[PDB]
Amino acid sequence: SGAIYVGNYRVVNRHLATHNDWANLVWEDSSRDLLVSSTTAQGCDTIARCDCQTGVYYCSSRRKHYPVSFSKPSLIFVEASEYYPARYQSHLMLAVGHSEPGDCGGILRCQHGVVGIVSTGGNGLVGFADVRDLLWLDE
Ligand SMILES: NC(=O)[C@H]1CCCN(C(=O)Cc2ccncc2Cl)C1
Ligand SMILES: [Zn+2]
């Protein structure tokens, strides 16, 4: 679990969105596993606007932050699950590191701010849904 709060927006994994998230829906994309809902309170997270390939992510299954090198956002095949059939997920970045299903929502950050959130994992690889291209989050 975990979300990004920027201005009047809440960014979450689409497979983990709540009834409230869907009732205050701004945008959602199944191919990216992302959903954005509106909020009454103001958010203070800073989104990075960069092409960084190094950062730090929070891993709840270990109660620890880990430094990682990660790939540029791309279409990567993701094995079937209870939330989606087998498909290519777009805007996905991979790193060598630990992750478990409950780790989704953990933030990945570089020196410029929030890069993305944990979205996939397995075989000693963790996947992050990139958010740096969503320029509208800041307006
Ligand atoms: N983005 C998706 O389609 C995910 C939906 C939930 C299931 N997905 C996983 O990868 C779950 C997983 C398994 C083992 N270790 C880490 C993780 Cl995050 C895929
Ligand atoms: Zn950066």
Comparing C-alpha atoms, which of 76, 56, 72, 74 is closest to residue 64?
56
Question: Sign of the CA dihedral 80, 78, 123, 55?
Answer: negative
The answer to whether 117 and 131 are in contact (CB under 8 A) is: yes
List active site positions.
15, 33, 104
Taking the CA atoms of 21, 1, 131 and 100 in sequence, report the sign of the dihedral they define. Answer: negative
Number of neighbouring beta carbons within 10 Å of residue 113: 19
Distance CA 64, CA 114 (A): 17
Q: Looking at 79-124, which runs of residues are DSSP E strands?
A: 87-96, 107-110, 113-122
Residue 57, sorted as left (phi over 0), alpha (psi -120 to 50) or beta, turns out to be beta
- Measured in Å, residue 60 CA sits from the centre of ligand 2 at 22
Residues with CB under 6 A from ligand 1: 15, 33, 78, 81, 83-84, 89, 99-101, 103-104, 119-122
Q: Do residues 90 and 32 lie in contact, with contact meaning Cβ atoms separated by under 8 Å?
A: yes
Measure Cα distances from 35 to 21, 61, 95 in Å.
8, 23, 23
Question: How many whole angstroms separate alpha carbon 1 and alpha carbon 12?
Answer: 9
The Cα–Cα gap between 91 and 22 comes to 22
| Cα-based angle 93, 86, 126 (whole degrees, multiple of 5) | 25
Per-domain residue ranges of the chain:
3-44, 45-139
- Which residue in 65, 51, 52 sits closest to 97, CA to CA? 65
Closest atom of ligand 1 relative to the 120 alpha carbon: 10
- Nearest CA, atom 19, ligand 1: 120
Q: What is the resolution of this structure in A?
A: 1.8
Supply the residue whose CA is at minimum distance from atom 9 of ligand 1: 120
**Rounded distance between C-alpha atoms, residue 10 and residue 124, angstroms:** 29
List the determination method: X-ray
